[PDB]
């Protein structure tokens, strides 16, 4: 197969001289490649899970050889339960090779062709080319690994054993299974996307030009309720969204949300769209919608975290500093585990409520003075492709990206508190970064005139180039905020999918109705003023629960960090 020419990453080449960062990078490369060829572990929740598994293996492999002081390994060597028992180094003392072994074994197990039975049903959809393309990435990473790879070393072999334990423990082969699920139409109810109601997929993936068959995808409807959690110590729930169950009476919030959805997330040339050019940029910047050569949101969050890590590293030598290695190893384990669990819980709630997307809500509203039967959103950008392909659909509430961001950035905050500065766990931090470029707006990627050619580099393919925008952020609190609201600008999520409207919008004298500027564009509170404290009720449970994905993510990250990254007790696993 012809190797896919991957575009250059906007990041200092010095980063990959550190082996921890190098392996994180390989995981990121596999993420973007798998979404380009349609391989395994695609979609938001599962792509996050792969990174969580990769980093847990690296974490325990490294720390087994170089024991930490203020914490321990995820699994222990003395665990009576064999499934949770970590292997012994027994002489192995080369952390570099141990990490290499863990990373390579995990990634290979995750992306290899499931010949061992799983080929049927599960893998029966992924082409052999998809597997070959992924194999290529793994093959060249071995050649690029700083310090080389020695598969004959006891240390490498030890890393491999660590990976085997984690893979056997946390891999969910049936992850995105939709077998048996069917939408339950009605008001507020999720259903097939009116702009992409069906997909024509080949009967034989290895014969893409042969007969096709209509298919209706539903992205992982059972994953959230049945999959094994990583480090969360309890179940997390959200308040009922406006219009459903206990909050069925919040019609003022719902109606105003529809109003805002139309003005802020409609297609650019619609007379009803009030979103500014700058807000459109903010919307695209955080997208990462499983596009060709781009991948999913977890990949971008990792790109951002890489810069933060290097920017605030304790020692200057990226290559030979054990302090830096331990630092990066611990940080990424925490960040990616939180990302994995955020994906589990956002998906659980998504499919629990089955709340419809703004597109369907506005079109099927039914009230002449509220809806727009012909409304169109700016939508999630279909980057490096000539059309808007069918992307696996899933409910709106809560926003997956909002949740991912909440967990990832709150984790970064908890981890760097006292070091970069000092702040309350629920107040803005000072973790600033600059020269942060999104692959959605990097002056290289584009919207093609013809179908993507996997044999040619992106710059040689005709299309409209995405403007290059270099950003600077004042804090992780800001990153978290913008990442969440960008979804409103895209028109893919309701305001409450991100967080409680009262916590992010400017209120008026009318309850549940928020302010807009001269142009009719919604006004947001200053990032420094934002506090996610507004809560709501649940019909099935007593108490007050958070509203939206950001609060959920923060809640998840705080719990994992407070417990010091400990395995979810098996007694509470599904």
Residues engaged in binding ligand VO4 (CB under 6 A): 44, 399-402, 487, 492-493
Beta bridge partners of 85: 76
Alpha-carbon distance 403 to 474, whole Å?
21
Nearer to ligand VO4, 34 or 346 (CB): 346
Identity of the residue, 20 or 488, whose beta carbon is nearer to ligand VO4 in the bound complex:
488
**128 touches 182 (CB < 8 A):** no
We find the least distance from the C-beta atom of residue 297 to ligand VO4, in angstroms, to be 7
**Of 147 and 392, CB closest to ligand VO4:** 392
* C-beta of 285 vs 561, nearer to ligand VO4: 285
What's the closest the beta carbon of residue 498 comes to ligand VO4, in angstroms? Answer: 8
Minimum distance, C-beta of residue 295 to ligand VO4, in the bound complex (Å): 13
Rounded to whole angstroms, how far apart are CA atoms 48 and 31?
9
Nearer Cβ to ligand VO4, position 266 or 567?
A: 266
CA–CA separation, 460 and 48 (whole Å): 31
CA angle at 385 for the pair 218 and 262, rounded to the nearest 5°: 65
- Could you tell me the smallest distance in angstroms from the CB atom of residue 166 to ligand VO4? 26
**Phi, psi angle pair for 486, to nearest 5°:** -55, -35
Residues 538 and 236: beta-carbon distance below 8 Å: no
CB of 487 to ligand VO4, least distance (A): 5
Q: What's the CA gap between 436 and 573, in Å, rounded?
A: 38
Shortest distance (Å) from residue 410 CB to ligand VO4: 17
**Residue with Cβ nearer ligand VO4 (401 or 441):** 401
Q: Which residues pair with 522 in a beta bridge?
A: 516
* Closer to ligand VO4 by Cβ: residue 155 or 303: 303
To the nearest whole angstrom, how small is the minimum distance from the Cβ of residue 52 to ligand VO4?
17
Using CA atoms, how far apart are residues 530 and 544, in angstroms rounded to an integer?
Answer: 20
Angle between helices 322-353 and 549-562 (to 10 degrees): 130
Nearer to ligand VO4, 39 or 43 (CB): 43
Could you list the beta-strand ranges (E) of 459-539. 463-465, 470-473, 535-536
Taking 3-state DSSP, the helix, strand and coil percentages for the chain, each rounded to the nearest 5, stand at 40, 10, 50
Question: Closest separation between CB of residue 497 and ligand VO4, Å?
Answer: 7
433 forms bridges with which residues in the sheet? 473
């Amino acid at each position: 197969v012809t190797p896919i020419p991957l575009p250059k990453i906007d990041e200092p080449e010095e980063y990959n001289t550190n082996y921890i960062l190098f392996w994180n990078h390989v995981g990121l490369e596999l993420n973007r490649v798998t979404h380009t060829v349609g391989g395994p572990l695609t979609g938001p929740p599962l792509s996050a899970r792969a990174l969580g598994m990769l980093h847990l293996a690296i974490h325990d492999a490294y720390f087994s050889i170089c024991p930490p002081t203020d914490f321990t390994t995820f699994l222990s060597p003395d665990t009576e339960n064999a499934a949770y028992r970590l292997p012994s180094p027994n002489g192995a003392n080369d952390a570099r090779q141990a990490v290499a072994g863990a990373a390579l074994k995990m990634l290979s197990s995750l992306y290899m062709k499931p010949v061992e039975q799983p080929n049927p049903n599960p893998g029966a959809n992924i082409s052999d080319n998809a597997y070959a393309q992924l194999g290529l990435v793994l093959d060249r990473s071995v050649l690029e690994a700083p310090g080389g790879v020695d598969r004959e070393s006891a240390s490498f072999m030890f890393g491999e054993d660590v990976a085997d334990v984690f893979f056997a423990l946390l891999n969910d082969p049936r992850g995105a299974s939709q077998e048996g699920y069917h939408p339950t139409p009605g008001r507020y109810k999720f259903d097939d996307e009116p702009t992409h109601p069906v997909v024509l997929i080949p009967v034989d993936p290895n014969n893409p030009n042969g007969p096709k068959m209509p298919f209706r995808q539903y992205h992982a409807p059972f994953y959230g309720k049945t999959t094994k959690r990583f480090a969360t110590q309890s179940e997390h729930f959200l308040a009922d969204p406006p219009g459903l169950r206990s909050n069925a009476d919040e019609t003022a919030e719902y109606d105003d949300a529809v109003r805002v959805a139309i003005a802020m997330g409609g297609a650019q040339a619609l007379n009803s769209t009030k979103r500014s050019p700058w807000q459109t940029a903010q919307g695209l910047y955080w997208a990462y919608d499983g596009s060709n050569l781009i991948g999913t949101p977890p990949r971008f969050y990792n790109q951002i975290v890489r810069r933060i890590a290097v920017t605030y590293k304790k020692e200057e030598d990226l290559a030979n500093s054990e302090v830096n290695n331990a630092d990066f190893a611990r940080l990424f384990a925490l960040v990616d585990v939180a990302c994995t669990d955020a994906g589990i819980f956002s998906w659980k709630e998504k499919w629990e409520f089955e709340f419809w997307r703004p597109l369907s809500g506005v079109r099927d509203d039914g009230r002449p003075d509220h809806g727009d039967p012909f409304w169109l959103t700016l939508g999630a950008p279909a980057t490096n492709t000539n059309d808007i392909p069918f992307k696996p659909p899933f409910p709106a509430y809560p926003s997956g990206a909002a949740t991912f961001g909440g967990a990832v950035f709150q984790m970064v905050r908890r981890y760097y508190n006292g070091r970069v500065g000092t702040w309350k766990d629920d107040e803005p931090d000072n973790i600033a970064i600059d020269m942060m470029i999104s692959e959605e707006l990097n002056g290289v990627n584009r919207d093609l005139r013809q179908p993507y050619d996997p044999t040619a580099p992106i710059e040689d393919q005709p299309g409209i180039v995405r403007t290059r925008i270099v950003r600077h952020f004042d804090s992780a609190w800001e990153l978290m905020f913008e990442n969440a609201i960008s979804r409103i600008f895209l028109g893919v999520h309701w305001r409450f999918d991100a967080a409680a409207a009262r916590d992010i919008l400017i209120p008026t004298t009318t309850k549940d109705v928020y302010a807009v500027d001269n142009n009719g564009a919604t006004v947001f509170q200053n990032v420094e003023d934002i506090r996610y404290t507004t809560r709501g009720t649940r019909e099935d449970e007593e108490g007050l629960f958070p509203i939206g994905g950001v609060p959920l993510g923060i809640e998840i990250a705080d719990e994992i960090f407070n417990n010091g990254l400990k395995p979810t007790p098996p007694e509470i696993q599904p």
